Design an enzyme around this catalytic site. Sequence first.
Site, PDB file in Angstrom:
ATOM      1  N   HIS A 244       2.664 -34.244   7.920  1.00 22.66           N
ATOM      2  CA  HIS A 244       3.452 -33.250   7.207  1.00 22.66           C
ATOM      3  C   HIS A 244       2.758 -31.903   7.380  1.00 22.66           C
ATOM      4  O   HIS A 244       1.527 -31.838   7.269  1.00 22.66           O
ATOM      5  CB  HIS A 244       3.540 -33.625   5.742  1.00 22.66           C
TER       6      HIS A 244
ATOM      7  N   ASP B 102       2.183 -29.153   5.721  1.00 21.04           N
ATOM      8  CA  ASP B 102       1.248 -28.695   4.695  1.00 21.04           C
ATOM      9  C   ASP B 102      -0.018 -29.539   4.706  1.00 21.04           C
ATOM     10  O   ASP B 102      -1.137 -29.021   4.559  1.00 21.04           O
ATOM     11  CB  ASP B 102       1.891 -28.755   3.305  1.00 21.04           C
ATOM     12  N   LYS B 103       0.135 -30.856   4.866  1.00 18.94           N
ATOM     13  CA  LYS B 103      -1.028 -31.725   4.906  1.00 18.94           C
ATOM     14  C   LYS B 103      -1.862 -31.508   6.157  1.00 18.94           C
ATOM     15  O   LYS B 103      -3.090 -31.666   6.109  1.00 18.94           O
ATOM     16  CB  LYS B 103      -0.624 -33.197   4.740  1.00 18.94           C
TER      17      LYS B 103
ATOM     18  N   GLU C  61      -8.201 -21.008   4.487  1.00 17.38           N
ATOM     19  CA  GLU C  61      -6.785 -21.324   4.427  1.00 17.38           C
ATOM     20  C   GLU C  61      -6.286 -21.541   5.855  1.00 17.38           C
ATOM     21  O   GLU C  61      -6.745 -20.875   6.794  1.00 17.38           O
ATOM     22  CB  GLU C  61      -6.012 -20.165   3.821  1.00 17.38           C
TER      23      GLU C  61
ATOM     24  N   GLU D  17     -12.386 -16.721   4.109  1.00 20.24           N
ATOM     25  CA  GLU D  17     -13.718 -16.165   3.945  1.00 20.24           C
ATOM     26  C   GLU D  17     -14.748 -17.269   4.040  1.00 20.24           C
ATOM     27  O   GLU D  17     -14.697 -18.236   3.269  1.00 20.24           O
ATOM     28  CB  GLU D  17     -13.862 -15.409   2.617  1.00 20.24           C
TER      29      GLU D  17
ATOM     30  N   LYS E 161       7.601 -38.178   4.625  1.00 25.32           N
ATOM     31  CA  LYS E 161       7.609 -37.985   3.185  1.00 25.32           C
ATOM     32  C   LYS E 161       8.178 -39.227   2.533  1.00 25.32           C
ATOM     33  O   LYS E 161       9.066 -39.890   3.079  1.00 25.32           O
ATOM     34  CB  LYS E 161       8.473 -36.792   2.784  1.00 25.32           C
TER      35      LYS E 161
ATOM     36  N   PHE F  73      15.985 -36.741  12.185  1.00 28.28           N
ATOM     37  CA  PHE F  73      14.700 -36.069  11.936  1.00 28.28           C
ATOM     38  C   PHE F  73      13.880 -36.173  13.219  1.00 28.28           C
ATOM     39  O   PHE F  73      12.835 -36.805  13.271  1.00 28.28           O
ATOM     40  CB  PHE F  73      14.048 -36.756  10.738  1.00 28.28           C
TER      41      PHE F  73
ATOM     42  N   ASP G 210       9.086 -26.987   9.969  1.00 35.18           N
ATOM     43  CA  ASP G 210       8.812 -26.440   8.642  1.00 35.18           C
ATOM     44  C   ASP G 210       7.395 -25.881   8.655  1.00 35.18           C
ATOM     45  O   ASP G 210       6.451 -26.610   8.969  1.00 35.18           O
ATOM     46  CB  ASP G 210       8.951 -27.593   7.634  1.00 35.18           C
ATOM     47  N   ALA G 211       7.208 -24.626   8.270  1.00 36.98           N
ATOM     48  CA  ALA G 211       5.866 -24.065   8.205  1.00 36.98           C
ATOM     49  C   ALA G 211       5.018 -24.796   7.179  1.00 36.98           C
ATOM     50  O   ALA G 211       5.499 -25.218   6.123  1.00 36.98           O
ATOM     51  CB  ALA G 211       5.933 -22.592   7.825  1.00 36.98           C
TER      52      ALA G 211
ATOM     53  N   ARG H 225      -0.389 -26.438  -0.629  1.00 36.04           N
ATOM     54  CA  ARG H 225       1.014 -26.529  -0.993  1.00 36.04           C
ATOM     55  C   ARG H 225       1.424 -27.967  -1.297  1.00 36.04           C
ATOM     56  O   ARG H 225       2.620 -28.273  -1.371  1.00 36.04           O
ATOM     57  CB  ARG H 225       1.894 -25.914   0.096  1.00 36.04           C
ATOM     58  N   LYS H 226       0.460 -28.851  -1.506  1.00 39.26           N
ATOM     59  CA  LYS H 226       0.691 -30.245  -1.876  1.00 39.26           C
ATOM     60  C   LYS H 226      -0.208 -30.631  -3.040  1.00 39.26           C
ATOM     61  O   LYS H 226      -0.788 -31.717  -3.061  1.00 39.26           O
ATOM     62  CB  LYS H 226       0.521 -31.140  -0.646  1.00 39.26           C
TER      63      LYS H 226
ATOM     64  N   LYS I 257     -12.486 -25.518   0.432  1.00 37.52           N
ATOM     65  CA  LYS I 257     -13.317 -24.869  -0.577  1.00 37.52           C
ATOM     66  C   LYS I 257     -14.599 -25.650  -0.814  1.00 37.52           C
ATOM     67  O   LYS I 257     -14.562 -26.866  -1.028  1.00 37.52           O
ATOM     68  CB  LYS I 257     -12.542 -24.811  -1.900  1.00 37.52           C
TER      69      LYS I 257
ATOM     70  N   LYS J  29     -16.319 -23.337  -5.788  1.00 31.29           N
ATOM     71  CA  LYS J  29     -14.928 -23.116  -6.163  1.00 31.29           C
ATOM     72  C   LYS J  29     -14.534 -24.228  -7.122  1.00 31.29           C
ATOM     73  O   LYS J  29     -14.215 -25.353  -6.716  1.00 31.29           O
ATOM     74  CB  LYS J  29     -14.034 -23.100  -4.934  1.00 31.29           C
TER      75      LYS J  29
ATOM     76  N   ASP K 102     -11.971 -24.863  -8.739  1.00 28.48           N
ATOM     77  CA  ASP K 102     -10.674 -25.500  -8.563  1.00 28.48           C
ATOM     78  C   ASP K 102     -10.824 -26.922  -8.066  1.00 28.48           C
ATOM     79  O   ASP K 102     -10.035 -27.801  -8.434  1.00 28.48           O
ATOM     80  CB  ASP K 102      -9.857 -24.727  -7.531  1.00 28.48           C
TER      81      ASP K 102
HETATM   82  C1  LIG Z   1      13.249 -30.293   4.606  1.00 26.26           C
HETATM   83  S1  LIG Z   1      11.781 -29.332   5.179  1.00 26.26           S
HETATM   84  C2  LIG Z   1      10.383 -29.994   4.250  1.00 26.26           C
HETATM   85  C3  LIG Z   1       9.872 -31.278   4.849  1.00 26.26           C
HETATM   86  O1  LIG Z   1      10.867 -32.194   5.004  1.00 26.26           O
HETATM   87  C4  LIG Z   1      10.654 -32.930   6.323  1.00 26.26           C
HETATM   88  N1  LIG Z   1      11.666 -32.724   7.193  1.00 26.26           N
HETATM   89  C5  LIG Z   1      11.756 -31.863   8.210  1.00 26.26           C
HETATM   90  N2  LIG Z   1      12.902 -32.028   8.898  1.00 26.26           N
HETATM   91  C6  LIG Z   1      13.542 -33.050   8.299  1.00 26.26           C
HETATM   92  C7  LIG Z   1      14.733 -33.703   8.560  1.00 26.26           C
HETATM   93  N3  LIG Z   1      15.590 -33.346   9.635  1.00 26.26           N
HETATM   94  N4  LIG Z   1      15.095 -34.717   7.745  1.00 26.26           N
HETATM   95  C8  LIG Z   1      14.311 -35.105   6.711  1.00 26.26           C
HETATM   96  N5  LIG Z   1      13.188 -34.542   6.408  1.00 26.26           N
HETATM   97  C9  LIG Z   1      12.772 -33.498   7.232  1.00 26.26           C
HETATM   98  C10 LIG Z   1       9.248 -32.373   6.779  1.00 26.26           C
HETATM   99  O2  LIG Z   1       8.236 -33.290   6.181  1.00 26.26           O
HETATM  100  C11 LIG Z   1       9.189 -31.125   6.304  1.00 26.26           C
HETATM  101  O3  LIG Z   1       7.865 -30.613   6.177  1.00 26.26           O
HETATM  102  K   LIG Z   2      -7.634 -17.833  -0.869  1.00 20.87           K
HETATM  103  K   LIG Z   3       7.551 -24.351   4.310  1.00 18.10           K
HETATM  104 MG   LIG Z   4      -6.713 -20.156  -8.706  1.00 17.86          MG
HETATM  105 MG   LIG Z   5       7.921 -29.993  -1.665  1.00 18.88          MG
HETATM  106 MG   LIG Z   6      -5.375 -18.188  -3.983  1.00 20.97          MG
HETATM  107 MG   LIG Z   7       5.785 -27.031   2.160  1.00 29.59          MG
HETATM  108 NA    NA Z   8      -7.587 -27.755  -9.884  1.00 26.70          NA
END
Ligand SMILES: CSC[C@H]1O[C@@H](n2cnc3c(N)ncnc32)[C@H](O)[C@@H]1O
Ligand SMILES: [K+]
Ligand SMILES: [K+]
Ligand SMILES: [Mg+2]
Ligand SMILES: [Mg+2]
Ligand SMILES: [Mg+2]
Ligand SMILES: [Mg+2]
Ligand code: NA
Lengths: 380, 380
Positions: free
Chosen positions: B14, B16-17, B42, B55, B166, B235, B243-244, B249-250, B270, B274, B276
């Site tokens: 994924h 983000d992961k 990051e 940093e 996912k 998919f 997807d960026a 973000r997880k 980190k 840190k 966090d």
């Molecule tokens: C919907 S975009 C967010 C996440 O959903 C998944 N995703 C991307 N494309 C698809 C798709 N066509 N069908 C189902 N899930 C998707 C990927 O894990 C992505 O990071």
């Molecule tokens: K930062």
């Molecule tokens: K995204």
């Molecule tokens: Mg913070």
């Molecule tokens: Mg989500």
């Molecule tokens: Mg921050």
């Molecule tokens: Mg995301």
């Molecule tokens: Na935390």
Amino acid sequence: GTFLFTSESVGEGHPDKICDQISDAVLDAHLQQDPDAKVACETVAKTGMILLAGEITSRAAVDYQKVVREAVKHIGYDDSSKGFDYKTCNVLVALEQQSPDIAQGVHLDRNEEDIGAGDQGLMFGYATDETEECMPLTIVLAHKLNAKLAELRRNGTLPWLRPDSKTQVTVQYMQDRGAVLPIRVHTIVISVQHDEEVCLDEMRDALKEKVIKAVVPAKYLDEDTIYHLQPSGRFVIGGPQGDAGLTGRKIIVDTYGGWGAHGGGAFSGKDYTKVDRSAAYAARWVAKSLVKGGLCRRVLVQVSYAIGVSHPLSISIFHYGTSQKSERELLEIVKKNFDLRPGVIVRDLDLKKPIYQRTAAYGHFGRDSFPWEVPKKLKY
Amino acid sequence: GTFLFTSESVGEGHPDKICDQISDAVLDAHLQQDPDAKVACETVAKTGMILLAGEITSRAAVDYQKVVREAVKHIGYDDSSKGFDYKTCNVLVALEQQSPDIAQGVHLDRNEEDIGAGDQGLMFGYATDETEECMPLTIVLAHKLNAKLAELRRNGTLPWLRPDSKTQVTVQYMQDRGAVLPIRVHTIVISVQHDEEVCLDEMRDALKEKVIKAVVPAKYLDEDTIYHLQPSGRFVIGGPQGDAGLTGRKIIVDTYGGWGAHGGGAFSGKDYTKVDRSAAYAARWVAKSLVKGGLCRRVLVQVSYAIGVSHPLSISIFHYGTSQKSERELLEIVKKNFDLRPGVIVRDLDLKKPIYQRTAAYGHFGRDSFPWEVPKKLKY
Ligand SMILES: CSC[C@H]1O[C@@H](n2cnc3c(N)ncnc32)[C@H](O)[C@@H]1O
Ligand SMILES: [K+]
Ligand SMILES: [K+]
Ligand SMILES: [Mg+2]
Ligand SMILES: [Mg+2]
Ligand SMILES: [Mg+2]
Ligand SMILES: [Mg+2]
Ligand code: NA
Ligand SMILES: CSC[C@H]1O[C@@H](n2cnc3c(N)ncnc32)[C@H](O)[C@@H]1O
Ligand code: NA
Ligand code: NA
Ligand code: NA
Ligand code: NA
Ligand code: NA
Ligand code: NA
Ligand code: NA
């Protein structure tokens, strides 16, 4: 019988919040021209750089250089002496169309009311009767402290202030049949970026007298309250130069300050088909409707979705013991009064309207009578 | 008396992961050479691109091209047909030293035990006796479904699988004096990236028979369980191309799946200063120690910090009614048995050790007997 609870907030120039605001400025710019724009715009900020990365399919013609730079100008980063300047920073764009595989599974050839969720995920809404706006006092106060800093920066009365700030408020509470009652402020932290010339004692005195005392009712402050004002001792380097920012890295600041729960999904940069935002707004609307309707004093609502499926997979209500009705009864009331399909939420909450940049600082909830903050009259 | 609760997980690919894993590969690479490296790395991922921004102040000599590409290789993105290739992607680096203003306020000229928190913030730990590993069943199952997908991809038995996945699990629970008891699985979602050649019915059959039935005990599955398997229908485009991705973000996938609470701070990239990360690990350790020690069945711990200050500003214990002791008594036990200064946590939890990439997929908690998962014997 008392306990402490802490929440934080950050200012408009905190680098993560800069990114949220830019992402939502991009969203708004698209929606102004194409109400059906599909937008998933992430922003990254570091010294001298704003990068846009993500996916947009839209009929709009958007000048990203202008939109980004105008957002940074508004925040207040307008000179190299402040560490960042909208006039001269780098704006880089790595935006592509929405994946066709997503589009076909979510919205292509679907009746709007029956559009699928744009992703799977879980979302929560929360409301608490401890303030009129139905938000936790800890985060309300933390947000207001950052807003006060920006006000005094912009009106020139503390001209050494810069836009990057963070605040944190710890409140002592008592419990009352599942509801919570604020007693006093236990600790306040304020850190804010500042110019090279102002000294620490001047800043600490101003933060107490002109910021804290202007925001926090005196009844909550006493001889035992602990103040950590400019605790690092020096904060001249700030904004993206001091710390990289990314969209969606302030999701607890954006919501309930640690109270309630969070499903993990960021809000900014996303159109209504992304249920991370629309369903969290709807869940807030449900929670606030239950509290303002007199059914609960405090409530947490969970909803979840699968990509491509319109109706939520699950809905859950947790009332902390603050209702005479059972959670099952409240769930039935919710199911009878709300339709949580994204293609219905968009109509109820007017989510094609380009108001999103206004949500991207000082929290998405508890402010400004947005549609999700106007309670629905419940029939039961 | 029953309720639903939903949690999600994502796979190693994924986007983000991917970023979390790369950020922690960078951290580990620094710590292998400089145990006192200050790291705040990051990562952003989009089609063809990994960008590192943040940093780092370290005595290590780190080859970022090699570290990033080796992490992507391990995940499985090794060919343009899969949408991403470690051999040929762009790796861009925007890393600077840690701000001197932060360094002077946090750690310069400070005794290690008395190092200040590297930031303000709030953190939570949670534990629940519903599983032996003291984690919610919803997220445990969601993680295991993604791990099973990766296993069957890597062993060649489902060669059409790609790394981006996912999952989402909804469990029906009953309440038991504040504790929660899983009854059955109500709904499962699985979406996973796949090759162009495999058809939808083949994938749905395999996901049920070879993934779900291999992971989820049959006692939880019945004729009413709802399955959303490849609900988008297609998919093929996936990973950063679809997807960026961004680090951090997880954060709910990384922790408790919506249960408990979250303070907002990301873990990956980190070092121990840190809070966090270090204080959330310590809070998990406290929570699990209370449950495994027999004091509670379920517990939430909050802690908070101010930048530059060693001791936490607040500590709070919420036991959901699952202890005979009051929350005040539990708080006293915690205060007598734990020292939550970051410069002590680092010693107790061995947080200079370069094991962080191992934490960055499948959750940071409930696995592998990391130090924060080994309960402390409590004296009271
Ligand atoms: C919907 S975009 C967010 C996440 O959903 C998944 N995703 C991307 N494309 C698809 C798709 N066509 N069908 C189902 N899930 C998707 C990927 O894990 C992505 O990071
Ligand atoms: K930062
Ligand atoms: K995204
Ligand atoms: Mg913070
Ligand atoms: Mg989500
Ligand atoms: Mg921050
Ligand atoms: Mg995301
Ligand atoms: Na935390
Ligand atoms: C400690 S880095 C995380 C955040 O803390 C703030 N920050 C940056 N530098 C300092 C500093 N020298 N003192 C206090 N807070 C800072 C900025 O809001 C930054 O985004
Ligand atoms: Na369009
Ligand atoms: Na909470
Ligand atoms: Na959400
Ligand atoms: Na409304
Ligand atoms: Na060093
Ligand atoms: Na929860
Ligand atoms: Na241990």
